[PDB]
Enzyme design. Structure first.
Site, PDB file in Angstrom:
ATOM      1  N   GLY A 125      -3.608  11.458  -9.466  1.00  0.00           N
ATOM      2  CA  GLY A 125      -4.731  12.232  -9.963  1.00  0.00           C
ATOM      3  C   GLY A 125      -4.980  12.040 -11.446  1.00  0.00           C
ATOM      4  N   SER A 126      -6.105  12.565 -11.922  1.00  0.00           N
ATOM      5  CA  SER A 126      -6.502  12.423 -13.318  1.00  0.00           C
ATOM      6  C   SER A 126      -7.831  13.141 -13.537  1.00  0.00           C
ATOM      7  CB  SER A 126      -6.645  10.939 -13.671  1.00  0.00           C
ATOM      8  OG  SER A 126      -6.949  10.757 -15.043  1.00  0.00           O
ATOM      9  N   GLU A 186       8.247  17.483  -7.556  1.00  0.00           N
ATOM     10  CA  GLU A 186       8.481  17.073  -6.178  1.00  0.00           C
ATOM     11  C   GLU A 186       7.153  16.656  -5.560  1.00  0.00           C
ATOM     12  OE1 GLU A 186       8.021  21.413  -3.879  1.00  0.00           O
ATOM     13  OE2 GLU A 186       9.896  20.278  -3.773  1.00  0.00           O
ATOM     14  N   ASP A 201      -5.883  29.167 -12.374  1.00  0.00           N
ATOM     15  CA  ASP A 201      -6.784  28.134 -11.876  1.00  0.00           C
ATOM     16  C   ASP A 201      -6.603  27.918 -10.380  1.00  0.00           C
ATOM     17  OD1 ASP A 201      -8.779  26.272 -11.959  1.00  0.00           O
ATOM     18  OD2 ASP A 201      -7.577  24.676 -12.866  1.00  0.00           O
TER      19      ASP A 201
HETATM   20  N1  LIG Z   1      -2.308  17.834 -11.785  1.00  0.00           N
HETATM   21  C1  LIG Z   1      -1.109  18.236 -11.221  1.00  0.00           C
HETATM   22  N2  LIG Z   1      -0.418  19.245 -11.783  1.00  0.00           N
HETATM   23  C2  LIG Z   1       0.752  19.665 -11.265  1.00  0.00           C
HETATM   24  C3  LIG Z   1       1.271  19.045 -10.117  1.00  0.00           C
HETATM   25  C4  LIG Z   1       0.520  17.976  -9.540  1.00  0.00           C
HETATM   26  C5  LIG Z   1       0.996  17.249  -8.311  1.00  0.00           C
HETATM   27  C6  LIG Z   1       2.387  17.270  -7.937  1.00  0.00           C
HETATM   28  C7  LIG Z   1       2.849  16.609  -6.814  1.00  0.00           C
HETATM   29  C8  LIG Z   1       1.934  15.873  -5.982  1.00  0.00           C
HETATM   30  N3  LIG Z   1       2.021  15.158  -4.889  1.00  0.00           N
HETATM   31  O1  LIG Z   1       0.957  14.712  -4.534  1.00  0.00           O
HETATM   32  C9  LIG Z   1      -0.081  15.040  -5.329  1.00  0.00           C
HETATM   33  C10 LIG Z   1      -1.498  14.610  -5.105  1.00  0.00           C
HETATM   34  C11 LIG Z   1      -1.773  13.706  -4.032  1.00  0.00           C
HETATM   35  C12 LIG Z   1      -3.083  13.277  -3.784  1.00  0.00           C
HETATM   36  C13 LIG Z   1      -4.144  13.731  -4.590  1.00  0.00           C
HETATM   37 CL1  LIG Z   1      -5.760  13.188  -4.269  1.00  0.00          CL
HETATM   38  C14 LIG Z   1      -3.900  14.625  -5.659  1.00  0.00           C
HETATM   39  C15 LIG Z   1      -2.588  15.069  -5.923  1.00  0.00           C
HETATM   40  C16 LIG Z   1       0.482  15.840  -6.357  1.00  0.00           C
HETATM   41  C17 LIG Z   1       0.056  16.540  -7.526  1.00  0.00           C
HETATM   42  N4  LIG Z   1      -0.651  17.612 -10.126  1.00  0.00           N
END
Ligand SMILES: Nc1nccc(-c2ccc3noc(-c4ccc(Cl)cc4)c3c2)n1
Length: 273
Positions: free
Chosen positions: A13-14, A89, A135
């Site tokens: 992600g971003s 995780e 959020d």
């Molecule tokens: N932006 C953010 N902040 C805290 C935790 C995470 C996070 C942690 C673990 C993850 N595992 O998968 C995803 C993930 C997978 C697919 C998409 Cl389209 C978005 C996030 C995580 C995100 N992201």
């Protein structure tokens, strides 16, 4: 050590919350997510027991980290000269509520009840640990597809829970309560109920109710999809303009629509497998 124990992979992600890369712990081949936050972007800083000052996101995650799988697990963090690197995780297979809903459209009430209940349980966990997420939206909820468990992620806009009024807010606008739009003031639990009200509506209708600030401060809820006469009630109750008129977490889970919720695995078998 940093580059030595984790194997960085693709970009997940971003990127206003930061940049998240898919990674794996070389130690045990455990799937993890590697999140990078630029120090310049950080607004809230919190002190740790070590006195060392770190991002607030770290302090929050450390407080809500335990045997509870309803909130994302912070495994480890590192400081770099210009950035912080969080190790979290990573579920697998996993998909966030936004994509899940974008694909399948409006969720059916049985599924929405299982998910929403889990979110309620997760948010209650954060409050019990002195953490306010701030959020809560479909994007910040992960789905462990195999176990049917939802994980609450991203405390970048969160804060320590207090009973006094909040004057700052950096979360999603379309999920923010009227008293923020209209006064730039709010109380944590009251506002959290409002966002959950948007979340619940988002699940049952496949989209969020309010688009502009005008719709938010008005707070009139139109349903575009066939929704149970009872779910609509709970939804409109969380979206009560007057914060005091809004449910408590106790009241929401006692609400009749929230009764007979599927266990996570049941939900996975019936709706995910
Ligand atoms: N932006 C953010 N902040 C805290 C935790 C995470 C996070 C942690 C673990 C993850 N595992 O998968 C995803 C993930 C997978 C697919 C998409 Cl389209 C978005 C996030 C995580 C995100 N992201």
């Amino acid at each position: 050590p940093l580059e030595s124990q984790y194997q960085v992979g693709p970009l997940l992600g971003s990127g206003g919350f930061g940049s998240v890369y898919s990674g794996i712990r070389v130690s045990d081949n455990l799937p993890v997510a590697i999140k990078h936050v630029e120090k310049d972007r950080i607004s809230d800083w919190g002190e740790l027991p070590n006195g060392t000052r770190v991002p607030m996101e770290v302090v929050l995650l450390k407080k809500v980290s335990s045997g509870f799988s309803g909130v994302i697990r912070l495994l480890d963090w590192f400081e770099r000269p210009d950035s912080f690197v969080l190790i979290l995780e990573r579920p697998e297979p996993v998909q966030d509520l936004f994509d899940f809903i974008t694909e399948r459209g409006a969720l059916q009430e049985e599924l929405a009840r299982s998910f929403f209940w889990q979110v309620l349980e997760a948010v209650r966990h954060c409050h019990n640990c002195g953490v306010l997420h701030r959020d809560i939206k479909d994007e910040n909820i992960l789905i462990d597809l195999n176990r049917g468990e939802l994980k609450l992620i991203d405390f970048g806009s969160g804060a320590l829970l207090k009973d006094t009024v909040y004057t700052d807010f950096d979360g999603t606008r379309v999920y923010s309560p009227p008293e923020w739009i209209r006064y730039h003031r709010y109380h944590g639990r009251s506002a959290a109920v409002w966002s959950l009200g948007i979340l619940l509506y988002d699940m049952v209708c496949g989209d969020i109710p309010f688009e502009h600030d005008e719709e938010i401060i008005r707070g009139q809820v139109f349903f575009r999809q066939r929704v149970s006469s009872e779910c609509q009630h709970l939804i409109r109750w969380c979206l009560a303009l007057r914060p005091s008129d809004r449910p408590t977490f106790e009241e929401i889970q006692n609400h009749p629509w929230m009764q007979d919720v599927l266990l996570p695995q049941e939900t996975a078998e019936i709706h995910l497998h």
